[PDB]
């Protein structure tokens, strides 16, 4: 029912630095065109958390909107002899890469965007851990995690993973465990906050406060086919702008509506709003929330 999933909050840039050959349809993503770093997120059921929060930012969008910092280095060369800095974090993740990707990206333990990358024209293997030779490569990067992001000033410097009975989750050793342990790949929820590391969680509990801020709207104009349109051009009631706009009841409560004189139509974005997450009993406003499938070791005997 939502026809505006490609009408992106923010700049809407779904490319990774160093892979710019599909900028025409990824920078920004919009109604028209294919984008190998974004289109996979909308395949029904593949990325269920993002699809529940699809008017929030992807990881690449959050990087280009300066909400999430890039890791140093920003891509790891999987081919390199004697290693790369991503290998430990990547190996504890169980991931499936489709064929023909040169790059795949993820939110690392420090809360920054890292990526693994193959040479030309090498593709990642199915487990995303190696490169192999391949008609032609995709021009973007495969998102390894199901997540979504938003801006936040809420300090998470005292927040840390606390998981009952867990000794290790991903690359995080949580506590001393000298007994015999059990091991499994688990799909674990996590969040990243201002000034925190990745916080893995026993349970994902989210709430959304809807509002009438700009990222709560999607605006479109007619290509002279729909085209994404920036609401910042639209005058507020009592204010000025550079364009004429119209929209739904929520839009017209705050913005001028000029009906048949409008250059664009704006409507409230389904599911948008400020997201908070419950973490060790307290609600906090995260930068990003997601799931990843990682090795987990639990106390046993």
Residue numbers in the entry: 154 to 287, 290 to 379, 393 to 469
Can you provide the manuscript's text about this entry?
While the Gc glycoprotein is responsible for membrane fusion, the role of the Gn remains undefined.
We solved the crystal structure of RVFV Gn to 1.6-Å resolution. RVFV Gn adopts a novel fold comprising 15 β-strands, 5 α-helices and 4 310-helices. Superposition analysis revealed a high level of structural similarity between that Gn structure and the one reported in this study (0.4 Å root-mean square deviation between 261 pairs of C-alpha atoms, respectively).
